Amino acid sequence: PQRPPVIWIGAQECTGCTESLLRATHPTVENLVLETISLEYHEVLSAAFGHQVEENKHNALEKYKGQYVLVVDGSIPLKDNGIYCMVAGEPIVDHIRKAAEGAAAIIAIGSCSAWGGVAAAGVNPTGAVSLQEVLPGKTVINIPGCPPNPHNFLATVAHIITYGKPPKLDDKNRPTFAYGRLIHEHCERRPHFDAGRFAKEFGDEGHREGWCLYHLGCKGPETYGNCSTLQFCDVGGVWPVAIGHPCYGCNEEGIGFHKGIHQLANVE
């Protein structure tokens, strides 16, 4: 049977969003590319290079017009007419706008494409923006995190394939199954928070009892995500807070890459 086509374009990416796929188990990346989808363009894995891989892109955009899912990782730099990311001699923003024209669905994977992320932080040297900002007429599905659990992406794609539409989205176009709730509103250390049982320094007695990390700068109170429930890597028990480090708010615009690690969160 024919598999649903996907076109993946990296902009100002660190490749962590692609690398997330290599940790996935349902599907594994090998099952993703051989059984679940046809990955028609992805520069990290493609056999073809240069003129050959450019041909692949053009052929796919034509053959699958109206049918492919476009995925973008990384921010898109608009300063100086787009020259901070040039592929085959052209600004990546141009490649992305072209591919968006024929897309059945468009996904910003990771905080960079979802809201600018680290690459757009602070002084923002390159005038980096989000995918949605470059595609004002399109509905961009945002899957933030730096990088997200890959299944936040894969189950979004699966919903599109299986049921013919995107999953339910919040008012930031994030899938509710993954981003519908604050981490702190579903965190196993909430009892400690409630009791005033707090780690004050890494390695202190409370830290070594698994107490709440609020006073270490945990951003769980202001970050939407599923890190405390879905967690990471499918081994069980693995997310930053469980390992002993506060949430940094990497999912959440205005938190991650803005607030200091040890800066305290606002609690609602």
């Binding site: 520069e43 690459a119 002084v123 990088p147 890494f202």
Partner: protein, 551 residues
Amino acid sequence: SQRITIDPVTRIEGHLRIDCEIENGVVSKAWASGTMWRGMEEIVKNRDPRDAWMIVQRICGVCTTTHALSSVRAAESALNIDVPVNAQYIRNIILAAHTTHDHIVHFYQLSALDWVDITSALQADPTKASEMLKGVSTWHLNSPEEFTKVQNKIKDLVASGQLGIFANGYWGHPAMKLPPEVNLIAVAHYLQALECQRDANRVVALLGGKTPHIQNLAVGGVANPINLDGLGVLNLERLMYIKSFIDKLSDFVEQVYKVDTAVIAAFYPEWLTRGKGAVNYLSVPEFPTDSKNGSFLFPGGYIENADLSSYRPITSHSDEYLIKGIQESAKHSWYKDEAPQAPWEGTTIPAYDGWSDDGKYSWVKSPTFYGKTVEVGPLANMLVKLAAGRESTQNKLNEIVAIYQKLTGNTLEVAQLHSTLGRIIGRTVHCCELQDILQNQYSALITNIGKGDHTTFVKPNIPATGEFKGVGFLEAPRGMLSHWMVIKDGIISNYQAVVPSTWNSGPRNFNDDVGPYEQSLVGTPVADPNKPLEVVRTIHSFDPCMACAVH
């Protein structure tokens, strides 16, 4: 001459353009160009030193962990903090397990399709393929039945007419030399590799809190709470779980990856005679095991003009000779200040003016060591270990050579390692030796906890006035990494990363000397200038990471 461009170079990390002048089917001159910049050095400036690692880790998600570790090491250097030994063990396990994943993925997912023809694999006899590996490997998943399963997956993919990542590959190219059987072996191993690298990253995740992008470091040590008797912390159950994954890596690494390295070399012996990038090599010692940021398990050093016998050992990350030699130039890069800069005095002022063959043509800076071009990465680290007389490295190289000799009747000399295939071999040797690092450091951690030491973190103080400077070295998967932090009035006033792919991929320098990628391509035969597979073969051997090179 004819001029070609390869843009994008695929099956790397990041955005790379390679241009070549070809004279009578031989590359005469090359240009390497990093085509994307973020300004990560500028983004991290004017923050608390403690915050840097979480931001600069995002320089790269392929070599995740590395910039995080280098950043905390740089802050600790500036502040004069001695990291607790348990924190070192944990950092070391993470780096070794990460690098295991990284190297496996590089050999298989990034590089193999330069050497392997999947179309040819469809013509293979799976039984003959299995028979070829008798007395070469003891791997348990080389049966004809395994190979038939794999062959049928390829057949189904090709039959679907949706080749995806395999579409328009270099099938039937004249530089593809493997027999059908060995192509099928390699595809089977490509798929098997994905499970091994997943196991390596489960190690990383259980200490890091996730991967990509670990979240267990601190300026002062780590955030892991060691308590064998604690619920919800790093207890003996969690450590046993880590160990269960550590133990799963060795067989694939030793019986598949190591063997395939020898097999590829055996079929492509001309690639031992090209792809030399430099005559000078640098590596830093790695995996500190004492309470004072030293006593490294792997040695470092500097080799000049390929002379192992007179190399200079580096045994400390505070080595003044190493520190003082490093500079970067932007003469042929898209930055304003062009004279060589020591990184504590570095600037990164963008000055894009488009491509010029004789002017600026890259976002990568040009590093030098006391004014010389240097190759970094697994070839450098292997040669340095051989120069040090490290028996573990000589023995591991000898095992690869023994397989190669069984297949070809020939041996390999050190002279032949200064090559595209020598570079691949160095990476494999590294991956193999890292499995002993993991066992060693897991055992050290269990032992130390047993003696009553549960310390993991030393809280820093950061003077609110004064200007002071630190540097964090790390031997990353692609070579020597350094982060250079200046603190003034309690915040970062300068931050400069000098990254291994910067050394290798950097453009012509202040004296117009050619760096490793560009040098390595001179002499490359190109059968078909429209499909310059030979160029990509050499470039891929360096494991380019352009997010790293440019940041």
